[PDB]
PDB file of C-alpha atoms in Angstrom:
ATOM      1  CA  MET A   1      40.605 274.712 349.814  1.00 41.58           C
ATOM      2  CA  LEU A   2      37.426 275.576 351.712  1.00 42.76           C
ATOM      3  CA  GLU A   3      36.133 278.282 349.363  1.00 44.07           C
ATOM      4  CA  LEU A   4      37.964 276.723 346.398  1.00 48.54           C
ATOM      5  CA  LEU A   5      35.030 274.499 345.399  1.00 51.59           C
ATOM      6  CA  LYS A   6      32.635 277.450 345.622  1.00 49.17           C
ATOM      7  CA  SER A   7      35.038 279.555 343.546  1.00 49.27           C
ATOM      8  CA  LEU A   8      35.144 276.863 340.860  1.00 47.91           C
ATOM      9  CA  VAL A   9      31.356 276.436 340.892  1.00 44.29           C
ATOM     10  CA  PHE A  10      30.953 280.209 340.555  1.00 43.34           C
ATOM     11  CA  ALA A  11      33.504 280.301 337.730  1.00 42.76           C
ATOM     12  CA  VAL A  12      31.505 277.686 335.819  1.00 43.84           C
ATOM     13  CA  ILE A  13      28.344 279.818 335.780  1.00 43.50           C
ATOM     14  CA  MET A  14      29.516 283.208 334.385  1.00 42.81           C
ATOM     15  CA  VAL A  15      30.914 281.826 331.127  1.00 44.66           C
ATOM     16  CA  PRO A  16      27.660 280.351 329.707  1.00 44.34           C
ATOM     17  CA  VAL A  17      25.463 283.210 330.910  1.00 45.97           C
ATOM     18  CA  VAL A  18      27.809 285.963 329.688  1.00 51.16           C
ATOM     19  CA  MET A  19      28.063 284.145 326.365  1.00 50.33           C
ATOM     20  CA  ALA A  20      24.247 284.103 326.417  1.00 52.88           C
ATOM     21  CA  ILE A  21      23.865 287.859 326.818  1.00 52.80           C
ATOM     22  CA  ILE A  22      26.466 288.188 324.052  1.00 53.05           C
ATOM     23  CA  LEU A  23      24.169 286.275 321.695  1.00 54.81           C
ATOM     24  CA  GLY A  24      21.351 288.381 323.129  1.00 54.24           C
ATOM     25  CA  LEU A  25      22.851 291.642 321.914  1.00 55.10           C
ATOM     26  CA  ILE A  26      23.837 290.135 318.554  1.00 55.36           C
ATOM     27  CA  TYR A  27      20.264 288.903 318.025  1.00 56.81           C
ATOM     28  CA  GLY A  28      18.691 292.162 319.180  1.00 54.47           C
ATOM     29  CA  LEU A  29      20.923 294.425 317.103  1.00 56.44           C
ATOM     30  CA  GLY A  30      20.447 292.191 314.064  1.00 54.68           C
ATOM     31  CA  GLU A  31      16.663 292.359 314.304  1.00 53.18           C
ATOM     32  CA  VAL A  32      16.657 296.098 315.043  1.00 51.20           C
ATOM     33  CA  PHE A  33      18.902 296.726 312.033  1.00 53.13           C
ATOM     34  CA  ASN A  34      16.614 294.586 309.867  1.00 51.67           C
ATOM     35  CA  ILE A  35      13.490 296.513 310.871  1.00 51.81           C
ATOM     36  CA  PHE A  36      15.249 299.887 310.584  1.00 53.28           C
ATOM     37  CA  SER A  37      16.556 299.081 307.092  1.00 50.75           C
ATOM     38  CA  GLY A  38      13.272 297.527 305.945  1.00 51.49           C
ATOM     39  CA  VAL A  39      11.691 300.959 305.495  1.00 50.69           C
TER      40      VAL A  39
ATOM     41  CA  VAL B   1      40.416 282.070 330.653  1.00 47.60           C
ATOM     42  CA  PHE B   2      41.454 278.414 330.863  1.00 45.87           C
ATOM     43  CA  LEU B   3      37.878 277.312 331.545  1.00 46.25           C
ATOM     44  CA  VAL B   4      36.424 279.263 328.614  1.00 47.10           C
ATOM     45  CA  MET B   5      39.122 278.020 326.214  1.00 49.56           C
ATOM     46  CA  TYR B   6      38.490 274.436 327.332  1.00 44.65           C
ATOM     47  CA  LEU B   7      34.724 274.785 326.932  1.00 44.89           C
ATOM     48  CA  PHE B   8      34.994 276.466 323.520  1.00 44.92           C
ATOM     49  CA  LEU B   9      37.647 274.156 322.040  1.00 46.11           C
ATOM     50  CA  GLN B  10      36.378 270.838 323.497  1.00 48.23           C
ATOM     51  CA  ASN B  11      39.831 269.224 323.725  1.00 48.49           C
ATOM     52  CA  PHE B  12      42.013 269.390 326.835  1.00 46.70           C
ATOM     53  CA  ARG B  13      45.060 268.135 324.919  1.00 49.72           C
ATOM     54  CA  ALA B  14      44.524 271.071 322.536  1.00 48.38           C
ATOM     55  CA  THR B  15      43.654 273.702 325.154  1.00 46.35           C
ATOM     56  CA  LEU B  16      46.803 272.881 327.129  1.00 44.65           C
ATOM     57  CA  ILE B  17      48.818 274.459 324.295  1.00 43.78           C
ATOM     58  CA  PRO B  18      47.706 278.095 324.867  1.00 42.40           C
ATOM     59  CA  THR B  19      47.350 277.822 328.656  1.00 40.81           C
ATOM     60  CA  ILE B  20      51.020 276.986 329.268  1.00 41.86           C
ATOM     61  CA  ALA B  21      51.930 280.032 327.176  1.00 40.39           C
ATOM     62  CA  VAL B  22      50.498 282.288 329.905  1.00 39.62           C
ATOM     63  CA  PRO B  23      53.235 281.606 332.520  1.00 36.68           C
ATOM     64  CA  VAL B  24      55.923 281.979 329.844  1.00 35.30           C
ATOM     65  CA  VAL B  25      54.684 285.437 328.853  1.00 32.59           C
ATOM     66  CA  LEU B  26      54.105 286.519 332.461  1.00 33.19           C
ATOM     67  CA  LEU B  27      57.558 285.443 333.648  1.00 35.31           C
ATOM     68  CA  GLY B  28      59.220 286.955 330.586  1.00 36.61           C
ATOM     69  CA  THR B  29      57.473 290.255 331.281  1.00 37.92           C
ATOM     70  CA  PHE B  30      58.718 290.009 334.867  1.00 37.22           C
ATOM     71  CA  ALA B  31      62.261 289.492 333.569  1.00 39.18           C
ATOM     72  CA  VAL B  32      61.901 292.428 331.162  1.00 37.99           C
ATOM     73  CA  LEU B  33      60.729 294.655 334.018  1.00 41.02           C
ATOM     74  CA  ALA B  34      63.700 293.498 336.096  1.00 40.81           C
ATOM     75  CA  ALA B  35      66.088 294.313 333.243  1.00 37.30           C
ATOM     76  CA  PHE B  36      64.706 297.865 333.023  1.00 36.46           C
ATOM     77  CA  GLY B  37      64.891 298.469 336.782  1.00 40.93           C
ATOM     78  CA  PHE B  38      61.113 298.614 337.206  1.00 37.67           C
ATOM     79  CA  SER B  39      59.622 297.361 340.469  1.00 34.89           C
ATOM     80  CA  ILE B  40      56.654 295.054 340.976  1.00 34.52           C
ATOM     81  CA  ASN B  41      53.749 297.393 341.707  1.00 30.66           C
ATOM     82  CA  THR B  42      49.976 297.422 341.358  1.00 32.10           C
ATOM     83  CA  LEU B  43      50.089 299.175 337.977  1.00 31.74           C
ATOM     84  CA  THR B  44      52.297 296.499 336.395  1.00 31.72           C
ATOM     85  CA  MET B  45      50.035 293.727 337.688  1.00 33.37           C
ATOM     86  CA  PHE B  46      47.013 295.589 336.302  1.00 33.34           C
ATOM     87  CA  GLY B  47      48.794 295.751 332.955  1.00 34.27           C
ATOM     88  CA  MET B  48      49.461 292.009 333.031  1.00 29.09           C
ATOM     89  CA  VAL B  49      45.837 291.310 333.988  1.00 29.92           C
ATOM     90  CA  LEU B  50      44.742 293.379 330.991  1.00 26.77           C
TER      91      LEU B  50
END
């Protein structure tokens, strides 16, 4: 009960940020593939 | 897993459907292990976590 609120608050923060790096790699690989294939 | 399903389906009455399937599968796997004589050990719990 004591650390339960902190555990929940911590659980709320990974999901958006991890999703964010996921979009980060999709964006980066998309752009790098575009520039590589442009030549 | 429950939190990410709720956030990415935006309906608690809809996200309750898959969440209650987790205990069913876990307990059924426990029963299957019991039927085969296997014992609850760290490896089996790692398999369930995966």
